[model samples]
Target chain A: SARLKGITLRIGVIESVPFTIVANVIDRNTTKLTGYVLDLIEYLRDKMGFVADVQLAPPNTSYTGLVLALANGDYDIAIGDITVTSARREIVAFSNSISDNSMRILMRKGTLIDGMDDLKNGKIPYNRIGIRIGTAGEDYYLREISGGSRNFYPLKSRQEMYDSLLAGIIDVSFMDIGTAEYVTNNIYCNLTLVGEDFDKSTFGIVTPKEWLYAKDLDVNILSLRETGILDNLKKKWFQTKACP
Target chain B: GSARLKGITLRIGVIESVPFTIVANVINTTKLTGYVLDLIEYLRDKMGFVADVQLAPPNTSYTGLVLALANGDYDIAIGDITVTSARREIVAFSNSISDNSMRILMRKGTLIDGMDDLKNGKIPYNRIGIRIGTAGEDYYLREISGGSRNFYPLKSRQEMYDSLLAGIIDVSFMDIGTAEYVTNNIYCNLTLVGEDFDKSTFGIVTPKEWLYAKDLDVNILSLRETGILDNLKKKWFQTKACP
Candidate 1:
């Protein structure tokens, strides 16, 4: 207790492939977890001499819940594929954007769906699209689909939606390009991206809007970005020549 | 459909206009009815639709006709009423039977060229008259004044034209076809001020509950497909100067 001079940082993390959870979970066991967040935390702890802890939680739960828990002293920081929007900013403060990604339409491997206009004219059956709830992907789909007049189902988790697509329950699902690519290559190899990106959104680290630790966390993240550590993490987790 | 109209006496409403409506007054030897009745009779016999027509005379505006139709007093109303989006919410319209534009009618000396000039306040006019429930009134309310005040809603186009000629209102916003008809026969001195403003299609209005809406729409679609609508247009409007 006397040796520790600075505040302890409790980081809350939601599981994401190559970001928080390392894929090939069984075969690889070297260094810190082969994930962007795990590597970043390891760098903070080993190089900076900071006391930090990471808590892995279930994926697809609302980020708002994580922010509420962080605000209540359950953790000091929360990070995932969380988008910074005006609505979310009301409850949480987001770090400077870490990466720019887009929401894309993913269809079951064989269905030849093209773009928004085809969806609009009801050429394809409406009930085929699925979106995860409480995500920017869902928001973009809702606005574009005329309040979901078409048969767009809101699933609780991206994994569930992926499973549904694999099971042939739905024709298509919308998700962030990073998540879609990860799933297409590693999880559901049959799914294909339908069209160009729909909307560009930034993923950021979030803290409780009114938390006292927010300023310190912002400075730390900004410093990590100023150095080349952020870019290195992106290349390691996001871009890889895995799928042929 | 014939069984559906069993024992029903339909009430129809029409405004007075030549070719569409007519009126005759005589003092010494004979009494004459409006020509609109003859046209209605001809159409009814040829088309096999039965209805009793009532003319809303003098001081009776098209808004009153629509209100009467909505209140179940009039089963159908025919006028030069332009069909518009807002009006469609309250009542349904048959496919357009005629097309016309609301234009600026002005004195020869006035500098008002179009609605833009009038709206910009470049050309100052004392007052402008538009008929109630007419497209002209609704267009000006939505476009010019930003819908601030209701303008004078006269009963008929004749009254509007009369007020404009008497200088009671500096200009009257009337249907181009009706204004041309009146200017040719009645008001010789008045000249059309500018190109048509707010071009609109005229349709027959019926109460929302009337099954006639769907039937009329289908008939109009058929007419359009077979070029019957084009024939009607050539009969009524193609030769007209302003159409």
Candidate 2:
């Protein structure tokens, strides 16, 4: 417990709505960071007594970039809706999961498609398909469907992918289950998530390999999960917001 | 070369929850059989561990069975035990044994469609029969009526079915497999009233950091990967008792 006490830890963050949101406050020089991951950071900071020097990832940063940043020692820890994948685990240690996560298809309402098979079997054109760069979705598409052929439209952000689908720039895209569920039901009511979630995984805190305070952070995160605090926080962010 | 569990014997705890674990009584003999038992036999064959299967006492709550495992009464507990974060705090869970979700059970001709009816006060809380110490109770407390404790509590699955038929309760919540099996085969007058919600998975319960934990999970995951778990489910669940 004393390992992290009175220590200043550099925390890197990515911009994921409902998980981590970095906004420039009106008429203020400094930006404000808020969302579920931020709440978790605050909770852990309180329990472990670490001063958080939080820094947001620059624009157009890929999800994989954050882990690479942690691996390269750019940050002591990185936090967001970052999925724990086998490839990522090969490079850095991840704390116990902060949320259960999976991948789903995002499209406009009433799109006639059955499931993932349609995406692979040429029911949809490859170039019209959009994928966020350096994500599990892209990895799955490349490995399972595209077979390493980079034919799909390379997108950068969730908002861009959603907007692409809306403007007909791309007919379909992939999004994480939690964010896709929230955005479809509340933010983008015209968009609908089709097909069941695949690639079942969890979002974890990215800690540098063999970091001294990894155990301390994992212990408190597991405690939060066990005490229903994490679920309640999830419900707070995801369930409460409605289109109506 | 000897098997990994050549001389290992495990105290496995199981609860009788319909197709998961069914008890058949004959003259001077009691037999425990069902999907869970078949999976255990498969694991025994592959891993070479002798399983000493113990049936829980009558009306043993799933929560208590899990607690028994955590308290060292059994080496593992197997059944339709839904893996939840709260339970994971006390005991370790192996890789998922079955895909699962929650469904609402009610008598035929009931107008209720889903949980929204209950949440909107269309269905009175007093008429809901929730199994004590189960995920349904946890869901009700967290999602619908926090800390209300207003629903009628039943001890076992039979209580839920009997109470629904006898008009003791208007509805019950249950696992999707058990609900489909009962409404279609055993209890013809009852029906599942809503689309399945609360998608989850079932896992074998084990003591935290148990020595054989890795071995057990390895075998289980192998079974799932090889389609053996699917075959077992088909053998037990895909049966008809009513027209």
Candidate 3:
């Protein structure tokens, strides 16, 4: 009942968390993916009449890697908790903001820390920071801050970011606000959000430049929002284990 | 999308199962709810069908729910029923309504940190609470104790778990979804252990060769496709009433 019936779609996904919760909500099926991106692909496949081959990013692939892969034709499109930023938009086209996001820092609960705001004041040195490359989190630090003292250690997974912070491999790390809340509330007993988030932005799906299905994807995403489907999904992924 | 079955009213059978079908005595009226009721309601309301629900008689044991359905006591057996091979021979089954698997439930601080401890005999299976007539009991018999352990035969789903928390029994096994719901929301002092295993799905049973059963399957799939079934699972199973 649609134009893209039975065609193949290679999807690029990362462990973007909640949106693509890696530690939870796994794709038990052969597809090897789940969470908001997994759910969205399934819904789109049903609605658009296409077959999807959902793939994890090249092992240890970051947001920039996903975009470069999309541009390289390694996959048709990438979807996860990807933020829409001026830098990423220059490299790859983005669908409408799937979810709103911002940068937040997490630290041990009794670390005598309160906000990411204080760090930007320059009294705090840019030392021993952990980051995943190609993320807006990384860009937000490098473009505006970092002060040219690149002590950022690149990590592959959210688990590592948290583990590093605990192991004292890095004193702090940048995470999307959604992940920050989930980690602090449920996963970790010691970690808590550092004040409010900075560099607030919208999350979007990435497609290669001038992709044909861009408009169709946009229309349907908007349709999903209008129909309250995505709204319900947001609750499912975001609620503090309040929904099953 | 459905007007084909508007006038038809199907009879429903329910049981008192925790987080599936809880027959609560609200003042005086018997209020039926939990995951199963919500699913059936969504399907019926969306597909334009009626359901006359009732609890099955106590006599309909052993031969199983499908047998009861075949005997025409009800048009369908709807609850948290794990499908079995024998039932398929007697009656048709709707698609799995929920993903489920067996899991271990224990008090928060215990010597049994993992299954290896039980296998290595570091922890005793003494005084483990088990439901007398449920699939969980079947699993314990065939998989774990063979009825050799100090088994506490408690009745009702809630009581089995309650036995663990109230020190009525040392440990128990249950469906992971319910275990998670209890541990996360209601019974925070209780915790689930071991990798969730014996993976299975819960389904609705119907009479053998019933033509309408296929249509019912279609409706369930429609609900799954549109995310309503997932929503219902989340709505009921994850609700916290810890007061």
Candidate 4:
């Protein structure tokens, strides 16, 4: 208890669908962030009895940009679906696995394709593929598979990607499985997952490399997993989402 | 291994499916054991990672498990989640855990013989039962009902079994391993029916680009190649305890 006696930790948050989300803003001014990580942070605060100064990462913070803020001493920790790449581990310390992730292709229904075989075997041309800019899915198209030079369309938001498909703008959009699964099922009725997952990655909470914060974060995560609370949270956050 | 993943534990998501992962104890808090637990234990020792194997909430469906992985709920998930074209789009998987099949489960005294019998207009789709957010639901939606929501959707596979047993629903589909175990060992009244499709490989879930993804894949490959995986399957799947 003495370890966190009246301690206040500033938690930097980035917006990722279904993980750390902007549930909504009430009347005016105060913004509320709620998702799997948000609730986990609250649980930690309750256990250690610490205070959280939760701040949203700048308007349009990239996943790496949040880590950069952490490096600059902006927040005690950065939370979202931050992928754990070896390159990232070099710059920032990481907690245990928050979520294991992968990329999947979502396309408009009636696209007439079952899997990647259909695309590679001349069933669907590689042209008109959509990817979120600067994502592993983008990296995957460039390296993990072919079609780097194909008619690739990059979108900033997932909705636009789905919109691109519905409007007949693109044939397919490569998105993370979490977003792909949640959005295709709930928000976009026309969107359906097509091929298999590619470019496997891990998601973890980001902490400063200079401190012992990761130790605490990792242990708490272990405790959560032990209590089956982590799965309970997954049961809550994955299938359910807040209105944006 | 310690240097690369120091001070971090692995969260392996599991489910209460028989043979693979089972709820050895749920009355007091919870506990999980089976092929998955043994496999993870073997992997943990070989790879040097402490894992907290967890069962998803009782009745939580497979799609829910995948979403949990994407939402940073678990580092990896193992169990009945087979490699599928639709599911792979949103998640990454390790080397194959095993080959799997989905089968039909229904009451033994049946007016219908198999899925083809139902397909031959024996039972309507409205009379079928399925778990919400499951692969069975996906098949029913995409194939049987032509994207229709006309069947009974319960919270879990267990409920669907009960529905079939009580004459509330005509039939339902389940994983072959569990269906075989139940029909042969426990549920004398439950009969397996129909030709099954969705033949696929079961895999351990990880992030699409995890730093340690290869660590898992490589180790799993070796284990399978060395016949350790085959032994584990024998120990858990074939040689088992049933009431």
Most TM-score-accurate candidate? 2
State which candidate, 2 or 3, has the greater lDDT.
2
Q: Each model's TM-score, in the order given?
A: 0.45, 0.66, 0.47, 0.50
Which predicted model would earn the best lDDT? 2
Of the native A-B interface contacts, what share survives in model 1?
0.00
The complex in candidate 1 yields a DockQ of: 0.01
**Model 3 TM-score relative to the real fold:** 0.47
Total colliding residue pairs, candidate 3: 1
Tens-digit lDDT string for candidate 4 (A1-244): 1256378889888776677787666666676778887898888788767788888876656666678788888888877777665445556666556556777778887787777666556565555777676555665566534645634676776557767789898887677788778877767776788877765555667777635443455556545543456668878877854334
Write the candidate numbers in order of decreasing TM-score.
2, 4, 3, 1
CA lDDT for candidate 1: 0.63
Put down candidate 3 lDDT per residue, B1-243, tens digits, no spaces.
Answer: 112457688888877666777677788687888888888788788778888988765433423555767788888888877654444445555555665677878897866665565545564565667776566666666556655644677756567667887887767777887787778877778888887655555668776545464456556655654457767777777677655
Please report how far candidate 3 places residue A242 from its true position, in Å.
Answer: 9.0
Better of 1 and 4 by lDDT: 4
* Candidate 2 Cα misplacement greater than 4 A, ranges: A1-12, A25-29, A40-79, A84-102, A107-115, A123-130, A146-171, A181-244, B1-12, B22-58, B83-86, B94-130, B136-154, B167-173, B192-203, B210-243
Off by over 4 Å in 4: A23-30, A118-127, A147-151, A240-244, B1-243
List the DockQ of the predictions in order.
0.01, 0.07, 0.01, 0.03
What lDDT is obtained when candidate 3 is compared to the true structure? 0.69
